[PDB]
Amino acid sequence: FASNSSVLSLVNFTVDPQKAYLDFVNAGGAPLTNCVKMLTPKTGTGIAISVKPESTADQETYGGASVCLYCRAHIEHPDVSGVCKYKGKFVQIPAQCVRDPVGFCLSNTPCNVCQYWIGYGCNC
């Protein structure tokens, strides 16, 4: 609603947007909504970030740009690359976490060798 605009405005008033967002939702703030949830056959491999949807039966798949804080808030991406790791791809979120997909992605990292989420699929 106007609350999406609110938290997206807030992360412009800070030098650490990741921390601003997480501290905001951890203090009871409304998570960002209007993320682009896809419909998928839940028969994917289950990796974190993928060129096509890859949700298992325990996951949901989102359009990548819509769950990226930096894309949603039109602010600079932190990556040395400058290129977003999500935009143009799909991001799998554990089904128990769909209430705040952006907060999940800010709080977790795909395995570097394995490409599953650490703690949510990575067996390395």
Partner: protein, 289 residues
């Protein structure tokens, strides 16, 4: 109720050949909206059903497929339709999208502003438009339709296709008549939005030459007559099984040919979805001034 398991309804030749006055569109289901499975944007269901219907068409699907998507902004600042296209298309397809105001998108290239500011330097393979302007008797509209008609005549590969949203009041004589320059055409109405006069005007496999002489004003009257005659139930049953949703990886060849070389064999391959004619260079689509 087989039709409710289909992605939507396509205008049959039974109504294409009619000869009727333009009437008001009166649909039995009006203001009735469909619940969205899983809290998903309605445009997810609408674009997926459009894609499922295009899966039954002889689309050309080359490597590095060139797709432009107009009217891609929706739901306050996002682009679910573009994400559906990314889910549907080959991983090496290029998606360029565009809308008036800012939005965030999974396209390869996103251009803000009027569609007239989108400068297509080289011909494309597939055009999707959801452009619709919110603004007494129902005459052919102009608006972005002038731009789209010019695009079909100039910036569309032979063998390429278009899917262009129209409604009872948002439509163009000239665009219907350009459907006569494709191997096949229809109007497709998703089951997800079946209570609206919305339809997607589909031109499949552009031939660059008149195959069917169409009276555009008469054909819109036929489209409304069809909608007024045809029960359609809101439904997303077709999305219940997505195991074959992705566009087939056809490897459609891209050839450069002079107009003088386009003979019976080439027209036949174009018309079957087996060939594109356009440049095979690297694509460039920019913003004009």
């Amino acid at each position: 109720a087989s039709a409710d398991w289909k992605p939507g309804h396509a205008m049959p030749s039974l109504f294409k050949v009619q000869n009727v006055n333009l009437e008001r569109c009166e649909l039995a289901n009006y203001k009735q909206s469909i619940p969205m499975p899983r809290g998903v944007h309605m445009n997810i269901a609408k674009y997926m059903q459009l894609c499922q219907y295009l899966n039954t068409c002889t689309l050309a699907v080359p490597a590095n497929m060139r797709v432009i998507h107009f009217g891609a902004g929706s739901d306050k600042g996002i682009a679910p339709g573009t994400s559906v296209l990314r889910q549907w298309l080959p991983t090496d397809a290029i998606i360029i999208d565009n809308d008036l105001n800012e939005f965030v998108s999974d396209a390869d290239i996103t251009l803000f502003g009027d569609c007239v500011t989108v400068r297509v330097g080289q011909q494309v393979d597939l055009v999707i438009s959801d452009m619709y302007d919110p603004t007494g008797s129902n005459e052919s509209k102009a608006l972005f339709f002038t731009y789209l008609c010019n695009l079909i005549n100039n910036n569309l590969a032979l063998g390429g296709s278009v899917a262009i949203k129209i409604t009872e009041h948002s439509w163009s004589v000239e665009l219907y008549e350009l459907m006569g320059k494709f191997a096949w055409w229809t109007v497709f109405c998703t089951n997800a939005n079946a209570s609206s006069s919305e339809g997607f005007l589909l031109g499949i496999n552009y031939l660059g030459t008149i195959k069917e002489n169409i009276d555009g004003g008469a054909m819109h009257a036929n489209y409304i007559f069809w909608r007024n005659s045809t029960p359609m139930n809101l439904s997303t049953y077709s999305l219940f099984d997505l195991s074959k949703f992705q566009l087939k990886l056809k490897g459609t060849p891209v050839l450069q040919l002079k107009e003088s070389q386009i003979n019976e064999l080439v027209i036949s391959l174009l018309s079957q979805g087996k060939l594109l004619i356009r440049d095979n260079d690297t694509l460039s689509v920019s913003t004009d001034v």
